[PDB]
Amino acid sequence: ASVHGTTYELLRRQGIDTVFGNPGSNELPFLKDFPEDFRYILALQEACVVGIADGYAQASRKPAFINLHSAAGTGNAMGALSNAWNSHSPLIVTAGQQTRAMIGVEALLTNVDAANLPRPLVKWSYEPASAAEVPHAMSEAIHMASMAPQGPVYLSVPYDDWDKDADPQSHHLFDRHVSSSVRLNDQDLDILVKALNSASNPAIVLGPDVDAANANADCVMLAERLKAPVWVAPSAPRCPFPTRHPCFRGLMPAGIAAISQLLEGHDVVLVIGAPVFRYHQYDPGQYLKPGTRLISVTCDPLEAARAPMGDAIVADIGAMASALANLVEESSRQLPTAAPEPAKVDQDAGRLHPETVFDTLNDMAPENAIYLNESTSTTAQMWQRLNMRNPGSYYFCAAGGLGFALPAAIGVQLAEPERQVIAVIGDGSANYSISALWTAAQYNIPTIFVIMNNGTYGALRWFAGVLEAENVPGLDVPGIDFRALAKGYGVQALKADNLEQLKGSLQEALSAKGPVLIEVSTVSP
Amino acid sequence: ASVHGTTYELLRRQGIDTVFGNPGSNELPFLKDFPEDFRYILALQEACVVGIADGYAQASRKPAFINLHSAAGTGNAMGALSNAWNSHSPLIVTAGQQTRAMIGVEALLTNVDAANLPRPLVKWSYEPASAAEVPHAMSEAIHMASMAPQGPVYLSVPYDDWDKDADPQSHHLFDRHVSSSVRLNDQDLDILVKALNSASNPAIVLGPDVDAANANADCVMLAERLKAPVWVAPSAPRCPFPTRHPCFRGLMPAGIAAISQLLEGHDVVLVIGAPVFRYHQYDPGQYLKPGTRLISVTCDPLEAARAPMGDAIVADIGAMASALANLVEESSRQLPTAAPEPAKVDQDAGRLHPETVFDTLNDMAPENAIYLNESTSTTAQMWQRLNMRNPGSYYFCAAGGLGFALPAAIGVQLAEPERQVIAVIGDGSANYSISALWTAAQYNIPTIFVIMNNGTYGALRWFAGVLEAENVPGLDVPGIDFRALAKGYGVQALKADNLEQLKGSLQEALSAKGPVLIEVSTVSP
Amino acid sequence: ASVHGTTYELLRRQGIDTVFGNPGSNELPFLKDFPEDFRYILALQEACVVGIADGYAQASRKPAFINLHSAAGTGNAMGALSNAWNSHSPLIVTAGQQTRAMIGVEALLTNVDAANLPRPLVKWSYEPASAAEVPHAMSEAIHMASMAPQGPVYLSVPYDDWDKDADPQSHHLFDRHVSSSVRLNDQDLDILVKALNSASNPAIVLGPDVDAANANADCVMLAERLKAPVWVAPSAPRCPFPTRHPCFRGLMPAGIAAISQLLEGHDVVLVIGAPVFRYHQYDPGQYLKPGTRLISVTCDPLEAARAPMGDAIVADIGAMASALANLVEESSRQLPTAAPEPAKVDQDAGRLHPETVFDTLNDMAPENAIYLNESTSTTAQMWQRLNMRNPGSYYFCAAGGLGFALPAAIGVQLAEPERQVIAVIGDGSANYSISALWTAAQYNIPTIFVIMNNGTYGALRWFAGVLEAENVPGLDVPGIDFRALAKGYGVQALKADNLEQLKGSLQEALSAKGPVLIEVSTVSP
Numbered sequence A, B, C: 001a002s003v004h005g006t007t008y009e010l011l012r013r014q015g016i017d018t019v020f021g022n023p024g025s026n027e028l029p030f031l032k033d034f035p036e037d038f039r040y041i042l043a044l045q046e047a048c049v050v051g052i053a054d055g056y057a058q059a060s061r062k063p064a065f066i067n068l069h070s071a072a073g074t075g076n077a078m079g080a081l082s083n084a085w086n087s088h089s090p091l092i093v094t095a096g097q098q099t100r101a102m103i104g105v106e107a108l109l110t111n112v113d114a115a116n117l118p119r120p121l122v123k124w125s126y127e128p129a130s131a132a133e134v135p136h137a138m139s140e141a142i143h144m145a146s147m148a149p150q151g152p153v154y155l156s157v158p159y160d161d162w163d164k165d166a167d168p169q170s171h172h173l174f175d176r177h178v179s180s181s182v183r184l185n186d187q188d189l190d191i192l193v194k195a196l197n198s199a200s201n202p203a204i205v206l207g208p209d210v211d212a213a214n215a216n217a218d219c220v221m222l223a224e225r226l227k228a229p230v231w232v233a234p235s236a237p238r239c240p241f242p243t244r245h246p247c248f249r250g251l252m253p254a255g256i257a258a259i260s261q262l263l264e265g266h267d268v269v270l271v272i273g274a275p276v277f278r279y280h281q282y283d284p285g286q287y288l289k290p291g292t293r294l295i296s297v298t299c300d301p302l303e304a305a306r307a308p309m310g311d312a313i314v315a316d317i318g319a320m321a322s323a324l325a326n327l328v329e330e331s332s333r334q335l336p337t338a339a340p341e342p343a344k345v346d347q348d349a350g351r352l353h354p355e356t357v358f359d360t361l362n363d364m365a366p367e368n369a370i371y372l373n374e375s376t377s378t379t380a381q382m383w384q385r386l387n388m389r390n391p392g393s394y395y396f397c398a399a400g401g402l403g404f405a406l407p408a409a410i411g412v413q414l415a416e417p418e419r420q421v422i423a424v425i426g427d428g429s430a431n432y433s434i435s436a437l438w439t440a441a442q443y444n445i446p447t448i449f450v451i452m453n454n455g456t457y458g459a460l461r462w463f464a465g466v467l468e469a470e471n472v473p474g475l476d477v478p479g480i481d482f483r484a485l486a487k488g489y490g491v492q493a494l495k496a497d498n499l500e501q502l503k504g505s506l507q508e509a510l511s512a513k514g515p516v517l518i519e520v521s522t523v524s525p
């Protein structure tokens, strides 16, 4: 067998059937004779290729396979890899290299020092020392991306390798199963359960790896048994809990002092599936107040090591959430009462307040909608105003890197064809990966893109205002016609300058058979 | 003085007055109180920011300064850095880091292991160990980018550093001058000159560092004295010689065997300012034929070390070209005769042959036009059909990384406001950095963008056809309306479906007062 | 031809005829059929292998070739590589890798991520992508080590490559000549010469690259014409000037404030072949005083970029020293007067003062002796008390890394068989690379090793005393019998407990036909 044949067999035997790509000449010997059982999803720039694969992997809860062109294609994807690293996304990134005979002389399209290029944003990065090694290297890449803590990996392959003979012992790779589905040993788990049962005022904090594990329902059971309030850890890349459940208390502020103040009076704080903590603004103070102790359950040794406080347990989030949910006592305390609905903000017949937009989306969207957020000045409002009952209902760029939501929303919609995806994206953010719209049009992936157009980088302006920073350049982005950009890439486009038009545009988008972009005129910040 | 004040003084004292950027929160303390004598050029995505800075640096022959946001912004620029590395572009890339107090915990927007992120595509990469060190680190970055062989460098700065007190000894940095303007010692230069004077049939090969050095006119004198034919080294990022001078022989094919065959019968081949050689296709054979020896003059030790044949001298291209041009004898051989004009290809009243497009551009464009090429299947035609008399008249992505020409054409036009820039870009290539159009519109930088629309990745299809590679996915890019994309970003747009319309569109574009995009319907390959 | 045959031919054609090594199984296919015209120098640990090669390369002024075993052997050499980096030593370090078929599975003796292992202490680090590429990679390694600024490089080779067929085009590598023998262009050199001619009170500072270039005699002519005092730059790895010439002023103190004070009143300070500056102690103050400006000539862009003050020129030290020495005017100022001889320190009939040891070495050693220093608390005394008239007469660990002088002294003695090498090494320093003594015994390389035994890490104790640092552990090294260690490795050994015995021991050592170790009882600090 050829390296090509053997590698596609390994991929299908390991459950991979889709290649997200932007092709090039070093990759043609891989992509030729493309197997009939595989599908190729083209995007026009590599940040888009990786963003689409990333949303697809996060929503499908399985690895996604990517093929890019040498150094320049890999390099165009590195901002996307920064997000994938922080969201633990299992991405197998492959890139074609020059023929082995011309690497030394550095022919055009040589990826120099290739394994170093994507570092430090990958778990594993490698170029094989021979063609026959390629299937083994691919196997090692698949398992490195898929084992906890999941994350992106990188494999560089010289283009002449694909047609060479494969090692006949490569078949032992095809059906390997690798498990990291582990939980704390019985004795120490009994100790943890006793600490939770004994707490007078426990609190629970959940992060993105809960939603990645589909541990959401077990976390609901855990919170109900402990009669405990539940927050989402700051800078949240995913939504790990039903946002109108009585225990839910919302998104934590991303500040040291704000979080210790929030947790004051809670004797035991159980954090599951989050870093401790993804702070953002510098809000110095106590990490925890006297009387509070913290216990973190994380799938990632790096998270356990870097936490500035608390104990930690490194284990699988699905297995730990299920064990805790089923082992803890039912507390005799009263169940927390649900937060009230957010108030309607005053809205005239002109430009839309973001609050109005979220309230209208919540009123009209199906109950199993999936949202993506890249509208950076409106995140708090979004979290308060969208009832997200189900797992897999929210995605936000995990490293704060813009250019994620537009392509990711297409990958999520591909992963979840029966759940309407609605991406809410600022006018600034929309540009970073604008060309991803073309992939939605070409494959008829019916994502709805809601562009919040306020003319400025609003979160940055707000932050400049707080700093009393004067004379900062580059904060305004006037003069972009998003309906024309959508037309440019073949996507139906609508505009909403007021609430009447927003309602009508949403009704039309929701009944459409393809992707739709709605440009919404929102109030200046 | 503050680190902020001291660093802007160092920048202006070292000739830097423009910041190319896409801003973020880690950068606000740098960008605040932005000095009145500086200008900020915003672009909407970081590949565009760096591409614009890169064209500006290459055309101005001086370093360009860039400011990006942490890891995600740096990562979005890494494909652009792959080109900048291969073109020796002097780029000072700065990125903001989290406040020093939250780096350890990996707060959101921490650039982890920051100096490793852009490697291996930078000459130098660093994050200072203290705020007071920032001006010294910036000084070291400026000189590392600017010394031969020039190239991109990277500096990561924690956002809290800018407001701290600067080291009072930082003033010694402000006026430092560093020279790499060197040439081979007299004795060995005399030996080289004697070898050239003695050659029976010399040939000259010139690469991009000739145009970077503005050594073009000296190379003309050298070729006239030696009565030698002149080729441009393969995969050419720049044009180093007047393309209708009698000695000119065109772009070399990027193949080992093709080049040795081309050079057969030439006893001494003098290569100046090029790698030996930037081959592309794998065309195995002899590196040189018997009877040919090669001498390379390069500014880059890495080029001298990796050449598979020939002697080499590592020195400044400007100084060596001037010395050789002035020291060699006038040969009694006959001057080479000019190549004939290329023939007119048959053209009907329908879609345009690329040859027709280049002939029409050559007929109408000013004699001091500057061209950029990212129309990958038409490069040979372009080189044959455009008379480029002057230095600085051609740019092509030096690493083959698409997404260069559209933003670079804006930077070149900014650098050369009295030379009309015309970027010829394929419909595939146009998407990678499409949002750069907005910067042309906003700052009214009057670049003309000619989009060659044939609906496909034509160079890849052609290469697949040569490989007899069947069933390759992802080669077609139908359904893009480039006039709508131009409208989206505020750029006047025209379409040319036939020659009459191409002529009219060019006449209108050439008389326009702002940027213009022309979508040209070209023949399918 | 085989890769083995082709690679040894490339080595001999490039002037390499000696392999310094400690062998292993990954290297056996390289070392088998070892050519009759080559010689192999074994050392018992890899810090010793590299130290011996390093002294040999520095003294011979040509590259040295090293062969080590995989990761563990490379790793044992990395302290030695830290020194080689700072001394610009041209070392070609090769290490054997596992067979290509077992790299992926990480068999025992796989060098994982091999090219990253020696970074950041090498100029170039690589593992070839195929066996046929090995000769080209070796060629690129040879030129990278040998081009200015010279330095160590690293090549990892899978053991199965050596027996494979070589590329038939590899012969073009054999005779390549690469020159970096360059100097500043005429116009700017004329400007520099005029600045020197015009100076009222110039000073000259010389570093190790002067001695590496054998530019010492040209620097003498330059100093005589300018009638200028000459200092050696701080932390000196080599001696660049005759130490009893009338212009000589000694080793500069390694402190910022001390150096600006020393240079006060000098209007132009010309630094040649040194970093600006290799400070050591933290002695904050002005980098230069008002009235002093600095001009650095360096072969190393990194040195020019990082200097905190002055102008710089990046060029070959040999070519620049020769041009300056021959172009400057003879000043009418009076020639500097020679420093007086150092005084005799009072010495009783007991333990030796280091001053007594150096005075006695100076009295008895031949005028063309070569000294090495790794007696860290006595460096100033050594520089004052040894008349070193000739180039290549002094070596000190360029990164301050102990374990250099003992092996390096053996390599220097191998390079200079007619100059008596005398290594003066502290009792602490002697242990780091003690096993190197065996190589001197086995090959009868007649180095003399003078062990200064004061029982303590004296420089560290002194520094602790200055810091008023109490209760520092680990400063004493009692209970080492260096005559027994010398006997252990086959080297004749002598002891000197007083001056009578020191004189007798030196007389015996100087007349010996093999290596000799003298253990000298020196005064406690």
Ligand SMILES: Cc1ncc(C[n+]2csc(CCOP(=O)(O)OP(=O)(O)O)c2C)c(N)n1
Pocket (backbone or CB within 6 Å): A079, A374, A375, A376, A377, A378, A400, A401, A402, A403, A425, A426, A427, A428, A429, A430, A432, A454, A456, A457, A458, A459, A460, B022, B023, B024, B025, B069, B072, B073, B076
């Ligand atoms: C790749 C990248 N570049 C720059 C930034 C810095 N940044 C954070 S928020 C923001 C503005 C986003 O503007 P927009 O999408 O319009 O939303 P708004 O803040 O107006 O709600 C920017 C530029 C970033 N996070 N990522």
Ligand SMILES: Cc1ncc(C[n+]2csc(CCOP(=O)(O)OP(=O)(O)O)c2C)c(N)n1
Pocket (backbone or CB within 6 Å): A022, A023, A024, A025, A069, A072, A073, A076, B079, B374, B375, B376, B377, B378, B400, B401, B402, B403, B425, B426, B427, B428, B429, B430, B432, B454, B456, B457, B458, B459, B460
């Ligand atoms: C960043 C990047 N991604 C992918 C490629 C691979 N590639 C080389 S040429 C090419 C097609 C360019 O198509 P187009 O601009 O339409 O020009 P044409 O070949 O049709 O003349 C592609 C995708 C590349 N060189 N750079």
Ligand SMILES: Cc1ncc(C[n+]2csc(CCOP(=O)(O)OP(=O)(O)O)c2C)c(N)n1
Pocket (backbone or CB within 6 Å): C079, C374, C375, C376, C377, C378, C400, C401, C402, C403, C425, C426, C427, C428, C429, C430, C432, C454, C456, C457, C458, C459, C460
């Ligand atoms: C490899 C290495 N380890 C540790 C040190 C730290 N160090 C510098 S000087 C010194 C002591 C040297 O003692 P010795 O050789 O006896 O000379 P003395 O200071 O007594 O003159 C030490 C341990 C070093 N420079 N290099």
Ligand SMILES: [Ca+2]
Pocket (backbone or CB within 6 Å): A359, A362, A363
């Ligand atoms: Ca409602």
Ligand SMILES: [Ca+2]
Pocket (backbone or CB within 6 Å): A426, A427, A428, A452, A453, A454, A455, A456, A457, A458
């Ligand atoms: Ca906005």
Ligand SMILES: [Ca+2]
Pocket (backbone or CB within 6 Å): A116, A117, A118, A119, A120, B116, B117, B118, B119, B120
């Ligand atoms: Ca990297």
Ligand SMILES: [Ca+2]
Pocket (backbone or CB within 6 Å): B359, B362, B363
């Ligand atoms: Ca014409």
Ligand SMILES: [Ca+2]
Pocket (backbone or CB within 6 Å): B426, B427, B428, B452, B453, B454, B455, B456, B457, B458
């Ligand atoms: Ca095309």
Ligand SMILES: [Ca+2]
Pocket (backbone or CB within 6 Å): C359, C362, C363
């Ligand atoms: Ca004496």
Ligand SMILES: [Ca+2]
Pocket (backbone or CB within 6 Å): C426, C427, C428, C452, C453, C454, C455, C456, C457, C458
């Ligand atoms: Ca000692």
Ligand SMILES: [Cl-]
Pocket (backbone or CB within 6 Å): A184, A185, A186, A187
């Ligand atoms: Cl157990």
Ligand SMILES: [Cl-]
Pocket (backbone or CB within 6 Å): B184, B185, B186, B187, C183, C319, C323
């Ligand atoms: Cl000279």
Ligand SMILES: [Cl-]
Pocket (backbone or CB within 6 Å): B183, B319, B323, C184, C185, C186, C187
């Ligand atoms: Cl000159």
Ligand code: NA
Pocket (backbone or CB within 6 Å): A103, A104, A105, A106, B306, C140
């Ligand atoms: Na190479």
Ligand code: NA
Pocket (backbone or CB within 6 Å): A306, B103, B104, B105, B106
């Ligand atoms: Na950390």
Ligand code: NA
Pocket (backbone or CB within 6 Å): A140, C103, C104, C105, C106
């Ligand atoms: Na492996």
